[PDB]
Amino acid sequence: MKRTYQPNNRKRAKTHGFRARMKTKSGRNILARRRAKGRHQLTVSD
């Protein structure tokens, strides 16, 4: 019963990361969107 989630810090951070959302503008859209949702918390700090 190998499940789905395999914590791997480097994986997690290299997809999904603040840096990673810089890479692209769909990402940068996500960022601004979230900033706007009210101080949410964000992608790297979690």
- Sign of the CA dihedral with 10 first, then 16, 21, and 24 last: positive
Q: Note whether 46 binds RNA by CB under 7 A.
A: yes
| DSSP states of 2-40 | --S----HHHHHHTT-HHHHHHSHHHHHHHHHHHHTSS-
Sites for RNA among residues 2-41 (CB under 7 A) = 2-10, 12, 15-16, 23, 25, 30, 33-34, 37-41
Does 45 interact with RNA (rule: CB under 7 A)?
A: no
Give the footprint of RNA on this chain (CB under 7 A).
Answer: 1-10, 12, 15-16, 23, 25, 30, 33-34, 37-41, 43, 46
